[PDB]
RNA sequence: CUUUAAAUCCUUUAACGAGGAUCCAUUGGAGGGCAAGUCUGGUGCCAGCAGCCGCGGUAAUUCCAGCUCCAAUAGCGUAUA
RNA sequence: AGCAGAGUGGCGCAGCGGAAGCGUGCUGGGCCCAUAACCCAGAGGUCGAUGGAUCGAAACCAUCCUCUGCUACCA
């Protein structure tokens, strides 16, 4: 606890999780090429409702 | 500093423990002129004065302090002084032998704002014994 | 049930006068009158009466406003007065729930 | 080499000049308006978010961090007329 | 140094010969979902004390005690 007026407590007592070494994302023209391929090339005919691009069910 | 003393001198009540001499009584009411020894603390002119033994009855404010016919403003511990007490206007004036007697120990009626002024601005002029008298009267006056 | 104590910035106080608009003033045990606040967990669940012992939080940048944490009942206030976390001259005045 | 008062800048042109091409693309946001996780940990009407509705009460799709995703892109966010 | 007013239930008060009462406060119960109002009961009295005038005293008288108002009389 400490006090009700402790400033910045939740920023200061949360756990520190380090970053992850990830691959360089290509930016510019080929990113639009990847977006076009993933949207309008690899589409499969489904039924009902299409899940979102971040649908982590 | 002298100017700030001049405005805030009316609020600052100095601590005191001061003891009535038997039969050294020269007046009874309006004014009360009476020869009293100072057991502890120091007396300053304009002090509100009270009796703890009779449910914190107030006798009035002092006007003039005389040490063997000499007008001395400060009456310190160990000195037998003559104190002239004027009753507070608007209240009932007090008599000797009915509201208070010779066996009573009369103390200064300090206030919380006076304690604040003594702690904040009058830190230089008060002794450790005077601060102990302040704490003792604060437990007597039931001030938290 | 438990006896929570003070901390390095948390002290004790006694309510003097009940105040409107979800606030109160309480007499701290240092000689300073502090305007306290009712905690949002205490706005309807439990009530605070006049002259009761409560736990109060403080601000480290000002001393004009404060905030109440919890409230002590009669037996635990007497037990904490017996331990010595409270001054002996502090009048608890037997705060209790009547019938 | 060219330019120019003389340079510098651009263009031309020798020699060197990249693989995880570390020669590393940021700014906001993910409940609705309004494009985009009912993911995983911490606090528990506190800290804070929130232009507006509103979100936090010891299982937070809105807080604080990690992964993924979304909008524009050498640009993006905020305040005022 | 002294005078005047008062002393009855926790508080204020009526109060005089054939008589411990009033308003408020406290506790227990009922009524209501609960509180106040209301209803039913109870607790709490040296009538400040002593002595006398009396068949009959809280009352008529004398003294003392306590509280509140007054003569101004001091460094």
Curated annotation (Swiss-Prot), chain A:
It is found in: Cytoplasm; Nucleus. It comes from the Eukaryota. The modification N6-succinyllysine is found at residue 49. Component of the 40S subunit of the ribosome. Component of the 40S subunit of the ribosome. Contributes to the assembly and function of 40S ribosomal subunits. This is Small ribosomal subunit protein eS30. It comes from Oryctolagus cuniculus. The chain holds residues 77 to 133 of 133 of the full protein.
From Swiss-Prot, chain C:
GO terms for molecular function: RNA binding; translation factor activity, RNA binding; translation initiation factor activity; tRNA binding. The keyword Disulfide bond does not apply. GO terms for biological process: ribosome assembly; translational initiation. GO terms for cellular component: cytoplasm; cytosol; eukaryotic 43S preinitiation complex; eukaryotic 48S preinitiation complex; multi-eIF complex; synapse. It is found in: Cytoplasm. The keyword Cytoplasm applies. Keywords: Cytoplasm, Host-virus interaction, Initiation factor, Protein biosynthesis, RNA-binding, tRNA-binding. Residues 1-73 form the S1-like domain. Disulfide bonds: none annotated. Component of the 43S pre-initiation complex (43S PIC), which binds to the mRNA cap-proximal region, scans mRNA 5'-untranslated region, and locates the initiation codon. This protein enhances formation of the cap-proximal complex. Together with EIF1, facilitates scanning, start codon recognition, promotion of the assembly of 48S complex at the initiation codon (43S PIC becomes 48S PIC after the start codon is reached), and dissociation of aberrant complexes. Belongs to the eIF-1A family. Component of the 43S pre-initiation complex (43S PIC), which is composed of the 40S ribosomal subunit, EIF1, eIF1A (EIF1AX), eIF3 complex, EIF5 and eIF2-GTP-initiator tRNA complex (eIF2 ternary complex). Interacts with EIF5; this interaction contributes to the maintenance of EIF1 within the open 43S PIC. Interacts through its C-terminal domain (CTD) with the CTD of EIF5B; from the location of the start codon by the 43S complex until the formation of the 80S complex. This is Eukaryotic translation initiation factor 1A, X-chromosomal. The chain holds residues 24 to 122 of 144 of the full protein.
């Amino acid at each position: 606890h400490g006090s009700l007026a402790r400033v910045g407590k939740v920023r200061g007592q949360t756990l520190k999780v380090a970053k992850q070494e990830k691959k360089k994302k290509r930016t510019g023209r080929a990113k639009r090429r990847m977006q076009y391929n993933r949207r309008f090339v690899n589409v499969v005919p489904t039924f009902g409702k299409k899940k979102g691009p971040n649908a982590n069910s | 500093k002298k100017q700030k003393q001049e405005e805030f001198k009316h609020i600052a009540v100095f601590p005191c423990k001061m003891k009535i001499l038997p039969q050294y009584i020269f007046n009874s009411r309006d004014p009360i002129v009476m020869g009293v020894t100072v057991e502890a603390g120091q007396v300053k002119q304009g002090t509100p004065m009270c009796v703890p033994s009779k449910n914190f009855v107030d006798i009035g404010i002092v006007t003039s302090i005389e040490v063997n016919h000499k007008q001395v403003d400060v009456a310190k511990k160990g000195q037998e002084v003559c104190v002239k007490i004027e009753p507070i206007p608007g209240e009932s004036p007090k008599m000797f032998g009915r509201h208070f007697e010779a066996t009573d120990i009369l103390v200064s009626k300090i206030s919380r704002q006076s304690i604040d002024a003594l702690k904040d601005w009058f830190r230089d002029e008060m002794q450790k014994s005077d601060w102990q008298l302040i704490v003792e009267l604060k437990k007597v006056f039931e001030i938290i | 049930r438990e006896l929570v104590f003070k901390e390095d910035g948390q002290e004790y106080a006694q309510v003097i006068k009940m105040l409107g608009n979800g606030r109160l003033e309480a007499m701290c045990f240092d000689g300073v009158k502090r305007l306290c606040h009712i905690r949002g967990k205490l706005r309807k669940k439990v009530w605070i009466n006049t002259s009761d012992i409560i736990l109060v939080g403080l601000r480290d940048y000002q001393d004009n406003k404060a905030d109440v944490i919890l409230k002590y009942n009669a037996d635990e206030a007497r037990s904490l007065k017996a331990y010595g976390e409270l001054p002996e001259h502090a009048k608890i005045n037997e705060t209790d729930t009547f019938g």
